[PDB]
Amino acid sequence: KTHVQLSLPVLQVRDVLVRGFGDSVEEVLSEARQHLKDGTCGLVEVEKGVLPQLEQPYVFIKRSDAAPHGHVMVELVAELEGIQYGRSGETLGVLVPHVGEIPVAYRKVLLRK
Numbered sequence: 001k002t003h004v005q006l007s008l009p010v011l012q013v014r015d016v017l018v019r020g021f022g023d024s025v026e027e028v029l030s031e032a033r034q035h036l037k038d039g040t041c042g043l044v045e046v047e048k049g050v051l052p053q054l055e056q057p058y059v060f061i062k063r064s065d066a067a068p069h070g071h072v073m074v075e076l077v078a079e080l081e082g083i084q085y086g087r088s089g090e091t092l093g094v095l096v097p098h099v100g101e102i103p104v105a106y107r108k109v110l111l112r113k
């Protein structure tokens with residue numbers, strides 16, 4: 001399937017133990033996609049002071065369309081040193097590895113895979 005319904009645990013930035021997916025745009029997009037497949041991906045909602053507490057390159061989920069079965073359609077966009085790889089809509093948050101942190105909420109998304 002081209003899209004997969006996922007429920008992403010929303011984590012507080014100060015709880016996150018592993019603050020990015022790796023060291024290159026290509027690696028972080030690869031690792032994000034793997035963690036989204038394996039159910040080991042969390043979402044941090046972006047506000048003032050969040051991104052400097054996480055590791056670049058960043059992986060964002062961004063709205064790809066204006067929401068089947070409650071699931072917002074999203075795609076992945078990476079960022080390194082102020083350059084974005086991908087073009088998409090509003091940021092829903094930044095993806096990180098999930099290693100057992102307790103979430104504050106779930107974000108229902110339909111991920112373009």
Ligand SMILES: O=C(O)[C@H](O)c1ccccc1
Nearest residue numbers: 004033034036037111113
């Ligand atoms: O196809 C799968 O195994 C799975 O749906 C999946 C989820 C997220 C990204 C890629 C693939």
